[PDB]
Symmetry: D2
Amino acid sequence: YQPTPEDRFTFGLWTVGWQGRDPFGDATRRALDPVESVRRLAELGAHGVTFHDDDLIPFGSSDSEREEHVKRFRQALDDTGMKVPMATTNLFTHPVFKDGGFTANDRDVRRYALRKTIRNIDLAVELGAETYVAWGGREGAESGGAKDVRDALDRMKEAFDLLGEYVTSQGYDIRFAIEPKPNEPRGDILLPTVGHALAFIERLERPELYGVNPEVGHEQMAGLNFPHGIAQALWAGKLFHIDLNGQNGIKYDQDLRFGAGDLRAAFWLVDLLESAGYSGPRHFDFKPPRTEDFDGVWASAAGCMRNYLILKERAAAFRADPEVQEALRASRLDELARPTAADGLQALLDDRSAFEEFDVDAAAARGMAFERLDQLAMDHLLGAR
Amino acid sequence: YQPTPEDRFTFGLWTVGWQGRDPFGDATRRALDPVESVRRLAELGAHGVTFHDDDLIPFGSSDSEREEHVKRFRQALDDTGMKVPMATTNLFTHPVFKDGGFTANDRDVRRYALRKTIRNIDLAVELGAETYVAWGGREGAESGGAKDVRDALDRMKEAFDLLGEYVTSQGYDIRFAIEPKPNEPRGDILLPTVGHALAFIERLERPELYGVNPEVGHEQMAGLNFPHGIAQALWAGKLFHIDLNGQNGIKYDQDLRFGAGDLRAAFWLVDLLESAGYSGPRHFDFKPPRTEDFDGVWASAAGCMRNYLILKERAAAFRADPEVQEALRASRLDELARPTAADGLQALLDDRSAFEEFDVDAAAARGMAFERLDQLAMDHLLGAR
Amino acid sequence: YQPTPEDRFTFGLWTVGWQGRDPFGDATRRALDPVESVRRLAELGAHGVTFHDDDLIPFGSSDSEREEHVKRFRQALDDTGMKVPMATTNLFTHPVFKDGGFTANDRDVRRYALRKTIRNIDLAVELGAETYVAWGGREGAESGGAKDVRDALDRMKEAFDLLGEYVTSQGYDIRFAIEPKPNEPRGDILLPTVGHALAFIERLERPELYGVNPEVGHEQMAGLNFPHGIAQALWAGKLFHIDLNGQNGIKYDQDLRFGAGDLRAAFWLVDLLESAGYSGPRHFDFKPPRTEDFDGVWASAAGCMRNYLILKERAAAFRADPEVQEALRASRLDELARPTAADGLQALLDDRSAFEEFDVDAAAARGMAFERLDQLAMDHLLGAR
Amino acid sequence: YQPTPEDRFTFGLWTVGWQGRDPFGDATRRALDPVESVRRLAELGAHGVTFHDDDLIPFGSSDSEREEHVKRFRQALDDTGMKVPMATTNLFTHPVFKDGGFTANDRDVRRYALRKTIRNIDLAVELGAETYVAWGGREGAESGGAKDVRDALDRMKEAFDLLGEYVTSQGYDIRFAIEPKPNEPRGDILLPTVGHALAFIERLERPELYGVNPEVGHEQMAGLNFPHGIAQALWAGKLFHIDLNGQNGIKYDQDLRFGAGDLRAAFWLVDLLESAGYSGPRHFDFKPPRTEDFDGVWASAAGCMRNYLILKERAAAFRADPEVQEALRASRLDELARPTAADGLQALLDDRSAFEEFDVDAAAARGMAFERLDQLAMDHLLGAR
Ligand SMILES: [Mg+2]
Ligand SMILES: [Mg+2]
Ligand SMILES: [Mg+2]
Ligand SMILES: [Mg+2]
Ligand SMILES: [Mg+2]
Ligand SMILES: [Mg+2]
Ligand SMILES: [Mg+2]
Ligand SMILES: [Mg+2]
C-alpha cells in the first residue's frame, strides 16, 4: 500500500506544521520550515502541497522578505518535483478579522480582506495552482442581532463577484472552491453545509467559476452523511476539490487523520470518488494530535495515504465481486438508474397499471434485501472475503 | 394576546389529530373527525387548516366514499370561514413506500407515487390551496449500498419536473414547496437541509415553480441556526411556506408546540419574518404530547398562537427602542448594509487606504459591542424593559 | 465465522419479531410466533432468547391463556436446547404508562407497575433467568414543571428497594440490571447514561443486587464513548449484562445490527469484553430495518453474530502481535498500570525528583507515539496484516 | 436587578481575563492584572473571585516572585471586601500535561501533577477557600489503544485518595469538587458527565470529602438536561459548587454568558437552585467573546448577574401564583411526592386494587395537563402575567 505521486495525495503546510496549540494548551512542537515539510512529504510519496498566504509568508513581511520566502519555496518544489495544486487566504487568524473578512460589519475591513485575497491569487497562479479555496471561518455570529444575514449574504456575493471579475480580467485559468463549516470558531458560520454553499453559488454572476471544497469532518459536525453530500456536489458538477480527514461525531473540529473517525463512511466515500472518476487532488486537512513528536507527525501523515489506498482496494473488490453484482440486482439498484416515466406525462396518466390496477399489497411485500447487501460490503471492508 | 384569522395561523389536520402512537407505545387518544377539528380550530382563532390526502380520505376509499368525505369537509369550511392554503401527499405511511416514493428502487412504486400525488394536486386546487408541499420522508437509506444518490437525485428531479409539467399544462395557479429533514424515519434523508433543497431546485426545468417549506425542528436536528437558514431562503426568494414548532436539540423529531424548545431562536425567527414582511401562512406542524387528553390538545394548540403573538410584540419593541437603534449603529449594522466596493474593482485596487496604508492594528482594537446589544435583546424578550 | 451456542449469543423476541411500525409508518411484516423465532434462532447458532412479559403473554390474558402460552414456549426451549438468561417487563407500551411506571405522577399507576413487574419476576425465575433488566423508557418528561426529579428519584429508589426486598424474601437467585437511555420516547429520560445509573445504584438499600445493562446505541445518542463507559462499569464490578447493536451518531434510536454504525467503536468494545473476561450473554437488541422481508430478518440476525466473531479474531490478533506489544511499551501503557505513589504520601512530599528537580521540559518533549499504535490497530482491523 | 455581595456571585480570574486566543486566532485583548479584575468585579457587585494557580502566579515563578504576587492579590481583597471561595489547579496548559496529569501514561508526570496540586491546596486554604475544584481536561484519549480506562481509573482514584489523605492529615477544612466534561480538548474525557463523576466518588476511600462542580455548557455538550443532572446531584447530597454559563447545543465549549444559550433551561435551573436552598457560590465560568473590547468584557460579566436575578424573580412568581399551585395539583405533582407503598411489600401484594381490580383503561384516560402547566411557566418567564 505504497503511495506514488500518481495517486495525487496533497497536504496543507499547516497540517504537518501544526504546533499543537489548542484553546486550553500551549504548543507542543516547534515550528517547521516550509522547505523541510516539502522535502519530508516528497519522501513519503505525496504529490504536492497547499498553503495559506500567511503559512508561506509571515504576516507583515516586506516585499523584499516576501520575495526570498517564495524563492526558497520554489527551489524546494524544483528539487523534489512537488506541485502546488491549491492555495487559499488566511482571513481568520489576525485580530482584525475577529468579526469576519468578506462579511465583517466594518466596511474598511471588508475592503482589506479583498485586497489581501487578490494579492495571494496572483501568487497562486504564479506557482501553478488550479483551485483557489475560500474558508470563511470568521463569517458568522455568536448572537442574533450582531449580523443581519441577508445583508451579510449581499456582502458575500459582492466579494465573490469582484474576485471573479478580477480573475477574468487578468485572464487567469483558476477556479474558486467554497469550503463550508457549520460552526467553530464562530457560534454559527454562514454557508454552514455543502448544500448551503451550492445554493449560494447559483446566485453569483458567473456561477461556472465556483464550486465546493467539502471537508469530511465539517459535514459530520452537523451529523450529516458525507458521501451523500459529495454525491449531490458531483451531481451538480461542482466538486472542484475535497478535504479528507476524520471526525468522531458532533463535537469540536477534530481533524483526525483520514480513516480515523467514521470508518464505514470513509469506505463509502472512497467507493464514490473512484466510481465517479473524480480526478482532482486527494487533499488531507488534518492535525497530528499534540501528543505526538515529529516522528508521530510523519507516521500520522503516512497513515492518511495508507488508509485511502486500503479502502480503494476493498471498494474495488466489492464492486467487482459477481456475488455483489447479483445482490445489487436483487435490491433493484438497476431499476433506480432507469427513468420513471420516459414514456411521458400523458402516457403515465393513461397507464392503468400505475394506479387503478396497481397491486400495492404485492409490491409492499417485496423485501429490499438491503441487509444482505450491506453485510457483503462489511465482509469486503474487513477482508473476510 | 388573542389570535384573529388576520394573523394567518394554520394547523395540519394531523397535528391536533395525532393519536399519540409513538415507536414504543400505543395511541392514547381516540381519532378526531376532520369536521370537528375544523370547528374547534376556528373557535380558537385559527385562519385555516392543511391536509395530507390520507388525512381527509382514508386510504383505499372508493370514488363514492371520497366524494362524501370531501363534501362533509367543504361544508365545515363554509360554516366556519376557514381556508385551506396548503395541501400535501402522504408518501410515507403505507408499506409500499418503505423504500421511498419518488426515489424508491422499484420503478412501479415510483410511477404509483406520481399518480397518487397528481390526484391530490387536483383536489388541492379545488379547495383553493396556493402551495403544495412535498416532504420526502422515506427518500433515503440506512446503508451505503442501498441507494446510489446520483441516480436517486435524477429520479427526484424527474418526478418534480413531471409535476411542474402537469400544473402548467392544466393552467393551475399553485406552487411547490420542498420540506427538508436530515433523518427519521430513514437513517439519512435526501435533501437533508434548507441548503440542499435550495441547491436542488436550481437544477429543475422550471425553478420559478419551486421553493422551500422549512421546519424549525428539522434544521435543529442538524444543530443548525434556523433563523440563519430562513434568511438564506428569503435572500433567494424561495420562502413559500414555513412550519413552526419546537425542538430541544439534536435528537428525535419532537414536534413540540411553537415557543417550546429553543426560545431565543423563536424570538429571532419572529423578528426576521416580521421585519422581512413574510406574508404567507404561519403554519404549526406540532404534536400535542401523548400525556394529554383532548383538553390538553386544545391548550397546546392555543399556546402555539399565543407564543407567536408574545414574541411578535417583544421583537417589535426591540426594533423600535431608540436605545437599541443606537446600539445597532455602535455595532456597525448600518455599515454591513453598505456596499463594500460600489466604486468598482479598479478603484479598490488603486485605493491605498484599503491595503498599503490600512492601519490593521487600529481596526483590530475596535470592539464590536455585540454583548451590550445582545443583553438589550434579552431584556426586551423578558420584559425587563 | 460460524457461531456455536458456546459463544453465548442471545436475542430478544422483540428484535427479530419487530413488525416494522415506526412513528411515520405501518407494519411491513406479519407477527412472528415466539415458538417459530426460538426454532429459527437455534438453527442460526444462537444460545438463547430473552423476553418482555407482553412479548410472550399478550396483555390482558386470562390465567388459563397465560399457562398455555408458557407451556408452548417451554416446549420449544426443550426441543432446541435454547436458554432464557434474561427477562424484563414492558412498562412502556400500554397507554396507562404514558407518564411512567415506577415514577408516574399517579400513585395508583406506580403500584400497578410494581405488581406487573413482580408477577414477571416469578415467571423469569421459573424459566431460569439469571438477570432481570429494567428499562425505564417512560420515566422522564417533555417539560420542566411536569416532574420534580428529586421526588421522582425517591420513587425510583422506593420501587427498586421493594423489588430487592421481594427477591430476597423469596430466596431467588436473580440480579437486577438497569438499562439507561438519554431520550426517546420521553423528551429526557431519568438515569440517562451508564454513569447516572451507576451513581443511583449506590443509594439503594442492597446495592450488591443491582448492576447496569448498557446498550451501544444509547450511550452514542449522547455522543459518549461506549467502550469507555463499559470500562467504568467493569471497574465498578457492575456489568451484569450488555445490549449490542449499532447507531450512526446523535439521532433517533436506530437499533442497527451489531457492527453497523461506529465500526471502530465495535472493535474496541470487543477487545475490552474479551480482555476483561466478561462471561455474560452477548445480547443483541436490534431491529431488522422495515425494508426487509423475513429472509432479510434472518440475514440481519446472522450478521450480528458474524460481525462479533470477526472483530473478536482481529482484536485477538492485535493483542498477540509482538510489534503491537512493543508499541504499547513505547506509549507507556505499562507505566499507566503501575501505582503513582506506592511509596506513600510522605515519600512523595519528600521526593525532590517529583517537583523541585523535575525536568518538565524534557518530559514535555517525549512523544506519546499514539498515532503509530493506532495505525497498527487500523491495519489489524482491516486485515492489512 | 442590581447585584449585591449577598447574592454570592463569583467569577474566575480566567473569565474576564480571557485574551481571546482560540484555535484559529490570536488574542484580541491585552492581559488583565489580577488586581484590576478584583477591583472591577467588586464595583459590579460581585462577591468574590476564583483562580487556577497559574492565573495568579506565572508558571515557573521563584518563591520570591510568588510571595509578591500573593501579597499584591491579598491587598486587593482587603481593599474591596472580595472573598476567594474556590481555587483550582491548572493541569492542562503546559505541554508536560499533553496526555493528562493524574492519568498521564508517564508515572513521573503523574507524581509532578500531585505535587503541583498539593502546593496550591496550601495556598487556597491560606486565602480562605472552602472548595477545591478539579477539572481533568487532559485526562482522556483520541484513540482506543492509547489509554486503558480501567488502569486510568485506578490512577485517578489513587490521586484523589492521596489528596484526601493530605487534607485530613493537615487538618484542613476544605472539600473537593470534580468538574465533568465530555470532550474538548481531548477527543473523549474521563468522567464525562455528572453521573460518571458521582459514581466514581462512591469508590474513593473517604467519599464524604468529594462532590461535583457541574457546568451548564458541559452537560449540554452531551445533549443532556442540566436541571435534571443538578437534581440528581442534590438528591445525592453532592452539589458542592456550580459553574454557570450558556451553550447553544452540541458543539465546541462556547462558555457564553449565563442566560444565553438555552434560556428555558436557565429558568428551570434557577427555579431548582432557589427551591432546594442551594447556599454555595453562583460561579460564572464564561468567556466574553473575542469580538469585544474591555467595555464589552464588563458588560458581559454584568449580564451574567442580571440574567440570574431576572430569572430568580420569574421563578419565584411562578411558584407563588395560586393558579400555578392548582395546575401542579391538576398534574398530580403532589402525588409524586407521596410514597408508592408505605404500607409495605406484603400489603402491596395483598392489595387487589393494585392489580386484579385495577381499572387500567380509566387510569389511562386521565390526561396529565402538562401542556397547560408549561404554558403557565412560559407566561411567567416572559412576563405575560
Ligand atoms: Mg476541520
Ligand atoms: Mg479544510
Ligand atoms: Mg418535525
Ligand atoms: Mg413539517
Ligand atoms: Mg436502542
Ligand atoms: Mg436495549
Ligand atoms: Mg466550559
Ligand atoms: Mg468550568
